[PDB]
Amino acid sequence: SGFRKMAFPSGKVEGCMVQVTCGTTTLNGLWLDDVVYCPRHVICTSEDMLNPNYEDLLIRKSNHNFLVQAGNVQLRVIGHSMQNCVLKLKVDTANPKTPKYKFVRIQPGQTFSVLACYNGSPSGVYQCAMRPNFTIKGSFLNGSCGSVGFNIDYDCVSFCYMHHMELPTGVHAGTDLEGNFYGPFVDRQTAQAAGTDTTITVNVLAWLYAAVINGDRWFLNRFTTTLNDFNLVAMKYNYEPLTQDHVDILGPLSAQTGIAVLDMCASLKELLQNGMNGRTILGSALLEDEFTPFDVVRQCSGVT
Amino acid sequence: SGFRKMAFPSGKVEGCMVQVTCGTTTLNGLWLDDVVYCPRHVICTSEDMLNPNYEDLLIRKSNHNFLVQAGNVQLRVIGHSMQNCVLKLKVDTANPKTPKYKFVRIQPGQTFSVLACYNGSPSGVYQCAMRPNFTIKGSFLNGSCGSVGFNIDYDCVSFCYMHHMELPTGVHAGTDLEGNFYGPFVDRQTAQAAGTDTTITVNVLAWLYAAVINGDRWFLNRFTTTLNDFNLVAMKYNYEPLTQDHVDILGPLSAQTGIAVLDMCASLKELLQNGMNGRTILGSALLEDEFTPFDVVRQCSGVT
Ligand SMILES: Cc1ccc(NC(=O)Nc2cccnc2)s1
Ligand SMILES: Cc1ccc(NC(=O)Nc2cccnc2)s1
**Which chain B residues have a beta carbon less than 8 Å from that of A286?**
280, 284-285
Q: How many residues does chain A have?
A: 304
Pocket test for ligand 1, best of A118, A144, A165 (most atoms within 8 A of CB): A165
Burial class for B289, CB neighbours closer than 10 Å (0-12, 13-18, 19+): buried
Centre a 10 Å sphere on the Cβ of residue B243 and count the other Cβ atoms it contains. Answer: 13
Look at residue A32 and give its three-state secondary structure.
strand
Q: Which amino acid is at B237?
A: Y
C-alpha to C-alpha distance for B204 and A245, rounded to whole angstroms: 40
Distance from CA of B249 to the nearest CA of A (A): 22
C-alpha to C-alpha distance for B250 and A173, rounded to whole angstroms: 32
Look at residue A25 and give its three-state secondary structure.
strand
Longest Cα separation, chain B: 68
Centre a 10 Å sphere on the Cβ of residue A254 and count the other Cβ atoms it contains. Answer: 19
C-alpha to C-alpha distance for B227 and B30, rounded to whole angstroms: 43
Please tell me if residue B121 touches chain A, with a CB cutoff of 8 Å.
Answer: yes
C-alpha to C-alpha distance for B159 and B17, rounded to whole angstroms: 13
B38 is annotated as an active-site residue: no
If phi over 0 gives left and psi between -120 and 50 gives alpha, with beta otherwise, what is residue A275?
Answer: left
Angle between the N-to-C axes of helices B201-213 and B293-301, in degrees from 0 to 180, rounded to the nearest 10: 20
Please tell me if residue B168 touches chain A, with a CB cutoff of 8 Å.
Answer: no
C-alpha to C-alpha distance for B65 and B78, rounded to whole angstroms: 11
C-alpha to C-alpha distance for B74 and B276, rounded to whole angstroms: 55
C-alpha to C-alpha distance for A40 and A183, rounded to whole angstroms: 17
Q: Which amino acid is at B199?
A: T
φ, ψ dihedrals at A16, nearest 5°: -110, -5
Cβ neighbours for B89, distance < 8 A, ≥ 6 positions apart: B20, B29, B35, B36, B37, B38, B66, B68, B77, B79, B80
Task: Set out the domains of chain A in order of their start, with CATH numbers.
Answer: 1-14+100-197 (2.40.10.10), 15-99 (2.40.10.10), 198-301 (1.10.1840.10)
B41 is annotated as an active-site residue: yes
**H helical segments located in A30-124:** 54-59
Look at residue A294 and give its three-state secondary structure.
helix
Task: State in Å: Cα A111 to ligand 2 middle.
Answer: 29
**Which chain A residues have a beta carbon less than 8 Å from that of B302?**
116, 118, 123, 141, 143-144
Planar angle of CA A75, A79, A82, nearest 5 degrees: 115
C-alpha to C-alpha distance for A149 and A155, rounded to whole angstroms: 16
Point out the residues of A that are catalytic.
Answer: 41, 145
C-alpha to C-alpha distance for B220 and B244, rounded to whole angstroms: 22
Q: Pick the atom of ligand 2 nearest to B165's CA.
A: 8
Please tell me if residue B140 touches chain A, with a CB cutoff of 8 Å.
Answer: yes
Question: Is any atom of ligand 1 closer than 6 Å to the C-beta of A142?
Answer: yes
CB-closest option in A122, A128, A284 to B9? A122
Look at residue A183 and give its three-state secondary structure.
coil
Nearest Cα to A116, choosing from A147, A159, A142, A145?
A147
Burial class for B59, CB neighbours closer than 10 Å (0-12, 13-18, 19+): exposed
CA nearest A123 in B: which residue? B304
* Chain B residues 44-83 with CB within 8 Å of chain A: none
C-alpha to C-alpha distance for B163 and A144, rounded to whole angstroms: 33
Centre a 10 Å sphere on the Cβ of residue B41 and count the other Cβ atoms it contains. Answer: 24
How determined?
X-ray
Centre a 10 Å sphere on the Cβ of residue B62 and count the other Cβ atoms it contains. Answer: 9
Q: Which residues line ligand 2 (CB under 6 A)?
A: B 41, 49, 140-142, 144-145, 165-166, 187-189
Q: Pick the atom of ligand 2 nearest to B190's CA.
A: 1
User: What's the DSSP call for residue A41?
Assistant: G
CA distances from A78 to A31, A67, A68, A170 (A): 14, 11, 11, 37
**Which chain B residues have a beta carbon less than 8 Å from that of A5?**
5, 126
The secondary structure of chain B, three-state, reads CCCCCCECCCHHHHCCEEEEEECCEEEEEEEECCEEEEEHHHHCCCCHHHCCCHHHHHHCCCHHHEEEEECCEEECEEEEEEECCEEEEEECCCCCCCCEEEECCCCCCCEEEEEEEECCEEEEEEEEECCCCCCECCCCCCCCCCCEEEEEECCEEEEEEEEEEECCCCCEEEECCCCCECCCCCCCCCCCCCCCCCECHHHHHHHHHHHHHCCCCCCCCCCCCCHHHHHHHHHHCCECCCCHHHHHHHHHHHHHHCCCHHHHHHHHHHHHHHCCCCCCECCECCCCCCCCHHHHHHHHHCCC
Task: State in Å: Cα A234 to ligand 2 middle.
Answer: 40
For residues A83 and A178, the answer to whether their CB atoms sit within 8 Å is: yes
Find the catalytic residue in B16, B22, B38, B41. Answer: B41
C-alpha to C-alpha distance for B202 and B234, rounded to whole angstroms: 11
Q: Give the dihedral sign, CA A186/A187/A190/A195.
A: positive
Question: Is any atom of ligand 1 closer than 6 Å to the C-beta of A105?
Answer: no
C-alpha to C-alpha distance for B272 and B219, rounded to whole angstroms: 11
Planar angle of CA A66, A68, A72, nearest 5 degrees: 145
CA nearest B165 in A: which residue? A1
C-alpha to C-alpha distance for B62 and A9, rounded to whole angstroms: 34
Please tell me if residue A99 touches chain B, with a CB cutoff of 8 Å.
Answer: no
